[PDB]
Design a protein around this ligand. Structure first.
Ligand SMILES: [Ca+2]
Ligand SMILES: [Ca+2]
Lengths: 436, 437
């Protein structure tokens, strides 16, 4: 199957917002070395019948009046090498227009969004692609440098585009910058034990350059039935209540570390991102589209994770959220202020988890409805080379039987570990959870 | 205007990667006799000095890409090249000025103002082996500049060269380390099979003649010209082909067919002469297992469509477009392995695709814009080499600098006697007079 790039549109703001150049500063959350990555993902749309490309391009043009920094260039500052965003009149967001001879089925998927290096993504930190499928339907791909925004910030931007596409006269929320005012370090930096216990310094360590072999991607459908069984059996054995994220998180984390044959005394970490916009005092505004999340962690020696009961692991994950506070965030920022040059990292053995089940995927509607499927292609996230995603429920899941209902889990895992991991997921599917 | 050379810097790696000498083996893809050419390419930038920035980034890039500083020589057992690297080797950087503005010329996107050839070194045969990588920075009197490169095609393909230039550019932008570490391993990854075997796809394309020089044919002097083609006119052509044939063609297929026909027509190629449409495809991701990400050696193979000239010039464009489309069907792991094993079996026997080969290269959607040393991506890119793909008349699709005005550039190399008819063909194309049938 041949994907043909018909053209690349350089889409400028409808009305140029700048006189002369502006250099925007980024926050210490934005400048985290673990966010120096392009994040690549796509949305699949059902109907193709003006064209999706015409609608997306015109709406991008209008949105860029307020969101013009996405048209900018990331560069290192003159002083501390942290990134800033150079904005100037004439800059654009590239929209790649493509067409393939295929069916949405929802190797080749890699060609649906551009794949810049972290350094290349500095030059072009927001690239979109509209790919038309001959058989019906289309894909919106996005490659966004993670320093510019988190998922919530990208959702503000895309929702602004989408509401304009649906005929809004103006965007309903003015995007806020103010990044240094809102998330700048304290005058006397202070870093508490919860952040210090998590992070270490090593100028010689690249979290995304570890020699673990080729990282493979696989997808597993996990049934609601299986998860109800897991949670009920954990309750019967422990007296304790666990969420899907805690229980399935624990099972996958154990399986992966077991499958990788991690040394017994290696410290391993379960890491996830939490939105702190409303947690800060004072809170970040709704229109704050920069990174407004911090990583939270649970940590344990690998030998203990692989042989302790799942209810203990699930309880560690549950209890991780208790570190989430205004101070945790301030501590995290202050640590970046003190040690950005010193190679801040969470070490080897980090498994990142991202839960996309409970987000408003469906408001990103350009006229063809909400996406039928959403897929992240990136495998470098949260200081992990092996991140896991819980993907949203499809509409077919709510239309179908209870015993058919479930969601896909996308796993990134080193090739050598994948055979055993697949076996662990097959046992899961069979309800052979081996909980203790 | 007048171009003058101010000095020539010999840039060594910032830190010596070599204590001990080494001879690097090249692949059978690298040692293909059609790749015995210095590939010459220039990037134009509007605007410490560019020369300073380029020079330092080169020096740091050579820590990892030091074989570009080495010398090609023939091995002791066969006439195949190997690469001698040793401490002290350097990449020459030519520093130059020209006394006119980039603005005054087309940002070199119009006709040659008379010095375009002097913007990139043009090494002789022996010079290009001694110095298989040479750069040049030419400053224009109003501050803009051109980066020229002469790189021996045996060392790398376009994707390899792009790896290298992107390494220089990201270091110039203050990277703390390069994004992709380059991988050698050429012998192990792209060496021949112990029992060489060559399939019909490769055999049907290639022949043996120790007496034939694909780049020394007596066709007259080859000229270069450029044509702007609008996205509109391609849409029209594709819609007409679909209407008449029931087949959807890519731009490369449709425009490829049109240009190929027009060229063979204009050359008055004899009726029963076999003519070929040849292009290079990247096989890094096709191989089983795939080549690694930083494989910067040649990782492409030539694909072909062939047909008699008499049939090409009189059959419908849609038939020709289908021929080009169908040529991708040969692209497989075994096609590559067949190609490599043929080079093993017959390197000394003058492997060739014969007369009447027209090469096509589609460089529209390379990552041109990331080759940014701090003055932005290049405003104009220009290949000057015209000995490619066993053709003396290669054609490039290149990016250009409203929907009615949107498009790209076509750079054509064509013998002088055939240029006037070919010009009339591209004018008809521009007016939507495609004469398809
Ligand atoms: Ca610590
Ligand atoms: Ca033959």
């Amino acid at each position: 199957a041949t994907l043909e790039i018909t053209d690349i549109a350089l889409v400028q703001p409808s009305h140029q917002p700048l006189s002369n150049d502006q250099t925007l500063s980024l926050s210490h959350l934005d400048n985290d070395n673990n966010l120096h990555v392009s994040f690549r993902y796509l949305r699949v749309y059902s109907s193709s019948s003006e064209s999706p490309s015409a609608v997306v391009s015109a709406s991008l043009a209008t949105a860029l009046v307020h969101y013009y920094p996405l048209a900018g260039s990331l560069r290192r500052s003159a002083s501390d090498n942290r990134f800033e965003l150079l904005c100037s009149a004439g800059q654009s967001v590239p929209l790649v227009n493509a067409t393939v001879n295929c069916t949405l089925e929802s190797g080749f998927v890699e060609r649906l969004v551009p794949d810049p290096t972290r350094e290349e993504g500095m030059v072009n930190p927001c690239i979109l692609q509209v790919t038309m499928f001959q058989c019906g339907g289309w894909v919106l791909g996005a490659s966004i440098h993670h320093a510019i925004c988190d998922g919530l910030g990208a959702s503000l931007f895309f929702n602004a585009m989408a509401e304009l596409a649906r005929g809004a006269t103006k965007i309903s929320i003015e995007p806020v910058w103010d990044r240094e005012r809102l998330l700048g370090p304290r005058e006397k930096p202070w870093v508490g034990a919860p952040v210090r216990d998590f992070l270490s310094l090593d100028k010689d360590f690249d979290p995304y350059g570890q020699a673990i072999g080729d990282v493979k991607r696989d997808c597993f459908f996990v049934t609601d039935d299986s998860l109800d069984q897991l949670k009920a059996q954990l309750l019967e054995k422990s007296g304790l209540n666990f969420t899907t994220f805690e229980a399935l998180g624990a099972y996958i984390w154990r399986a992966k570390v077991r499958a990788a044959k991690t040394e017994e005394k290696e410290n391993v970490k379960f890491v996830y991102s939490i939105n702190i916009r409303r947690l800060m005092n004072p809170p970040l505004p709704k229109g704050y589209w920069g990174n407004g999340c911090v990583p939270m962690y649970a940590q344990i020696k690998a030998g203990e994770l692989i042989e302790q009961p799942i209810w203990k692991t699930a309880e560690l994950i549950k209890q991780s959220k208790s570190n989430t506070s205004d101070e945790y965030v301030r501590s995290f920022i202050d640590f970046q202020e003190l040690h950005h040059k010193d190679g801040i990292n969470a070490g080897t053995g980090v498994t990142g988890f991202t839960d996309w089940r409970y987000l408003g995927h469906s408001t990103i509607d350009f006229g063809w409805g909400g996406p039928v499927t959403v897929l992240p292609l990136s495998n470098k996230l949260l200081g992990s080379m092996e991140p896991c995603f819980f993907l949203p429920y499809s509409t077919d899941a709510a239309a179908g039987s209870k015993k058919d209902s479930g969601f896909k889990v996308l796993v990134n895992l080193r090739e050598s570990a994948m055979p055993e991991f697949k076996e662990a997921m097959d046992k899961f599917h069979k309800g052979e959870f081996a909980l203790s």
